[PDB]
């Protein structure tokens, strides 16, 4: 994959990896992921339920104060309009209630959801290609507390004090 | 410490955390009158000579303090306003100062001292030893007519590095016996001088 | 026929989009560059700062071939193009039942 | 349909389902909905008037509040002019009076409506394909309270604290 | 090249090229640069990490107070998400926490970072042409102090005091 | 021709042929104008440098203020990524600096620019047709002082008094 | 053949995005102003301060010739093109093997 400098440790989480995470704990059998998966295309007349987790441009990270905000877009797909408002009703009751509260992801580290507010609300979106497929979005801004707001300055001048200087 | 001891105006020094490290930090019933020694130092660099601006406030103390709103979005601040008195040992309460090798690019432009008009070398005909004696090396201090020690900033340059050799730092180690001209290499001005060699 | 030896490179892409593609095998198709006497004409998306092009042709293949959708192909010109879609005319003849023995799939160039 | 866990019971109510229901004990033979039905696109020179009701992103949640404010868009397909505006008069004289009333859905849950204000006016769209349908569409910003507050955080800490935990 | 007046010394620092000496010297197996290479192009199954920095139109710049700012959009391309998050974590460490940090570029002069605030956070772009490349997008807002801010307007008066007056 | 009447004079200066004017002085090699000639859309491959100024729309005029405000594009199109960094970087030390500076065109006229700050920072646009030309454009905020406010209302009079009145 | 010779320019764009082209030989090539009895049409980008066109065609040229993809070519009349893509028909007879000996490039003018 990708060779990290040894010194460097992870600082900000995976917003989305522990929304998975945490609604596959809580629906085990259907799949929830960031992407959709080859194999979840392949049946479409009787479509298995699914919900997609897209971190997307919002909110102001702040360093100083250890939080990473950013808007989160659930997107709920089911064979069924009920289904898919009884699932966004569930999405909606588990995120926003959320204060402070912690839960350990799959990776073993316990996070923080400092605050989960809604952005826009739910819409049923007209279908595309995928024609027995309704989907239900809607977007969060989460606020999630850093792993560590440590700083690396001193790696930094290290290196272009021994290369260059 | 020194953030909460100033905030609560108390000594915290003695507090002892408990054996699970948990302190708990009262505060005074009469609010103490503690003096502190402040510095407000900040550097601005120009290529990679900083320049080094701060205050000097020597008998500050707090006066104010403002509310604190305790969010989920943001952590705990402190803003306390500190109101600098005038010690009457220094006889100042504050004192503006600059310092770097940027303030010595910077300073003649200024207007602090007389402008930078000539340069010298305060080693007239300096003599080193070929043998590893005591006089085997020597120092070379340009300083100009402002009376700052150009010495880091002028490098120099030899005419002969096989009589005396004279780096960036002047150092006059010197190679073989014999007699060297050195030539300070500054910009605008520039400054000359005559090195020799002896064992 | 002449064909031309592919590298094909299957995978799955898991619910969190990490494409976990490896060297399936081989396989031996010929290259259309147009459905007739023409080309296909290369394409650009005029907002990526670079010089790349996009092109989609047709990979004529036995029928029974090793090949399936969403699975990427690189020939021995170091060109790479990903197979979109299923194959067509992977059928017998409707009125005789008669195969033409080819089955003709649908190549983008991601090169 | 979808599997929800045995120990989380509804907490928003369907504003769409909550006006559909409504809208069918008002105006018993003209049929409400939240889609288009297959059937009801079979005639258009002759067209049944209908009502359509979408959620649409619009209104913030609060859910210590036990509000769900949302924008709802209503749209009023008949084979006239005069006729929709009527029936679209109708839908506004009966949402935009409406404050802290209380109406039993079907599912037999009485949701209570906060207040209901109209975010555009009604206005006639142009014909599409369908040229013999004469739409008028308007919005409204509905907010309803919450069927119940309550919120789950002891299961998902019982989840992570024993899976993981 | 360009064949500049003899008499001007650059004012401004080049942020894509700071960062890109930075990230260089940072990863040094991983390219990274501001254009998409013709070479890199070339292998897209088995593709390799890189990172571009483009500037944006964006920040005011301040002459009197040697200030130059503007906007900077990192593009993380790796041909994982995962590995594309990771390195995005990377970059976004490494940018945040700086105030007033120096760096030496491969220039030899010595620039000073006064702020790299963050207006879009990251997000994974839907795939295009190239199918098999995951890229994760930021914009942060870098503020750098100028090389210096010595006016040439005697060379200028000079110039129209000897052609025209 | 434009045969204006007799007794009119001009009242604005032209920024474009102004700055035209000023980078000529400044860069004689170098071709600058307000638009792209035939000549030198000839040759891609070897591309001289040039620079193009475009007024456009924006600051307002104050005519009793003696003021005329405009926005200045500055589009800089060189051979060589770094060559149009470097022009950029030379126009940009030449305009930013100005405050009240006086400037004698090639008409005899002299100028006074008195402000000139950034709206939009430069950037690099994506190549078009003209694939081996790196253009680099930044809009500035120009203002120029009128070369005299005075009215001619005495003619306007005159005119409707003499055919009409 | 009549044949036209043409000057190529080869280099590789670098990460920071400098042009570095010069002149790599020479090449022999047909030019195609159109895939049949038509033209192709020039086109403009109507928000361009000037009077550019941009015009798409084809180079017949020898297989195996020192041409290939992002090559500028030059003609004895002064006009540029840049070579998009890869060749085209590059192979023999997919029946046979009969090599028709010429692989066509498509060329956008860039003047």
């Known amino acids: ?165 | 410490r020194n953030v909460l001891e100033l905030i609560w105006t108390q000594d915290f020094s003695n507090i002892q955390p408990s054996e699970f490290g948990g302190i708990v930090l009262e505060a005074p019933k009469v609010p103490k009158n503690i003096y502190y020694r402040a510095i407000l130092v900040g550097m601005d660099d120009r290529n990679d000579r900083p320049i080094w601006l701060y205050w000097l406030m020597p008998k500050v103390k707090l006066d104010k303090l403002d509310n604190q709103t305790l969010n989920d979005d943001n952590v705990i601040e402190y803003k306390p306003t500190l109101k600098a008195f005038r010690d009457d040992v220094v006889g100042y309460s504050v004192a503006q100062g600059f310092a770097g090798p940027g303030w010595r690019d910077l300073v003649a432009t200024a207007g602090f001292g007389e402008a930078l008009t000539a340069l010298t070398i305060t080693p007239g005909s300096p003599t080193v030893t070929v043998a590893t004696g005591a006089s085997h090396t020597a120092q070379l201090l340009v300083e100009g007519d402002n009376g700052i020690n150009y010495t880091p900033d002028v490098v120099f340059t030899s005419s002969a590095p096989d009589k005396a050799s004279v780096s960036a730092a002047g150092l006059v180690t010197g190679v073989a016996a014999g007699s060297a001209t050195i030539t300070a290499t500054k910009g605008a001005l520039t400054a000359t001088a005559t090195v020799t060699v002896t064992a | 026929m002449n064909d031309e030896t592919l590298t094909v490179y299957r995978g799955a892409t898991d619910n969190k989009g990490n494409p976990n593609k490896q060297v399936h095998g081989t396989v031996k198709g010929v290259f259309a560059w147009g459905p007739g006497t023409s080309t296909n004409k290369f394409g650009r998306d005029r907002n990526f700062k670079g010089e790349s092009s996009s092109l989609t042709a047709e990979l004529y293949v036995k029928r029974g071939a090793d090949l399936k959708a969403r699975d990427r192909i690189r020939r021995a010109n170091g060109e790479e193009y990903s197979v979109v879609g299923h194959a067509a005319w992977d059928q017998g003849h409707p009125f005789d039942g008669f195969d033409f023995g080819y089955m003709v799939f649908q190549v983008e160039a991601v090169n």
């Not at chain 1, 009884?86 to 799959?106: H, N, S, T």
């Not at chain 1, 400092?114 to 979106?125: I, K, S, T």
């Not at chain 1, 977007?139 to 707001?149: E, G, L, N």
């Open chain 1, 1 to 165: 994959a990708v060779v990290l400098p040894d010194w460097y440790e992870e600082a900000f989480v995976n917003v989305e990896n522990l929304f998975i995470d945490m609604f596959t704990d809580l629906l085990p059998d259907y799949e929830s992921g960031c992407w959709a998966p080859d194999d979840w295309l392949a049946d479409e007349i009787e479509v298995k339920p699914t919900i997609w987790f897209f971190r997307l441009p919002g909110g102001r990270v702040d360093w100083d104060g250890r939080k990473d905000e950013c808007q989160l877009q659930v997107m709920v797909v089911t064979g069924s309009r009920d289904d898919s408002w009884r699932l966004m009703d569930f999405v909606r009751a588990m995120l926003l209630p959320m204060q402070g509260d912690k839960y350990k992801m799959a990776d073993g580290y316990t996070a923080q959801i400092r605050c989960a507010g809604e952005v826009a609300g739910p819409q049923l979106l007209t279908p595309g290609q995928r024609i027995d497929t309704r989907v239900v979005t809607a977007t969060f801004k989460v606020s999630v507390s850093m792993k560590s707001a440590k700083n690396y300055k001193q790696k930094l001048y290290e290196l272009w004090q021994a290369l260059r200087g």
